[model samples]
Target: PQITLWKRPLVTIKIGGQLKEALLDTGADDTVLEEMNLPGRWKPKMIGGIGGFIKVRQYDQILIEICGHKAIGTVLVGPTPVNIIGRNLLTQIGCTLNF
Candidate 1:
C-alpha cells in the first residue's frame, strides 16, 4: 500500500467556542494545542509521548476535518513549538503506513 506523507492544515475550535487555523502533522501521535491559543484560566493534564512529557494547560473538544471527513475529539492545549496532525488522528481515519 502507498502511504501519503502530506501534512494537513486544520482549524482549532473549542467545544462550543470559536475556530482558529492550525497545522496538521500526520507524523504525530497526539493532538497538540498551542499555548497561545488556549485560555489561561483552564488547566489540563500533562501528556507524554516517545520523546517525553509535555505540559498541557487546557483540554478542549474539537472537530477535525480531513479529505472531506470530520472527526470530533478532545485536544490537548500547551506551548508546543508546532502543532501536529499525528498518528492519533490518522489511525482513527483508518490510515496505514507503507514502510
Candidate 2:
C-alpha cells in the first residue's frame, strides 16, 4: 500500500487491541505512545526529544496494526504529547520516502 506524506503524516494504528492515531515521524527511531494500560513487564527507560528527556516504560514485542498492515516491535509508553510511529515500525510496512 502506498501512503502520501502529509504535513504531519498522521495515521490510524491499532496497538494492544486498541485503536489510536499516531504521527508518522521519520526522525524518530522508536515508536512512542501516550500512557495506556498495556500488559507485560516493562523496563524503565528515558527518551530524548527536542524539549529534553522523559522517563518511559519500554514494552518489548508489541503487536501493532497500521492501516491494515501488521507489525511487531517495541513500544514506549509515557506522557508523550502525541503517539508516534517511527522508522522501526515503518520499515516493517515497506515504507519508502520519495521526495
Query: What TM-score would every model get versus the actual structure?
Result: 0.56, 0.93
Candidate 2 has a TM-score of 0.93
Determine which window of 10 residues in candidate 2 has minimal summed lDDT: 1-10
Candidate 2 residue-wise lDDT, 31-52, digit = tens? 9999999998899999999999
lDDT of 1: 0.59
- After TM-score superposition, the amount by which residue 21's alpha carbon in candidate 2 deviates from its true location, in angstroms, is 0.5
Tell how far residue 5 is off in model 1, in angstroms: 4.8
**lDDT score, candidate 2:** 0.92
Off by over 4 Å in 2: none
Evaluate candidate 2 by giving its C-alpha RMSD to the native, one decimal: 1.2
Number of the predicted model whose lDDT against the real structure is largest? 2
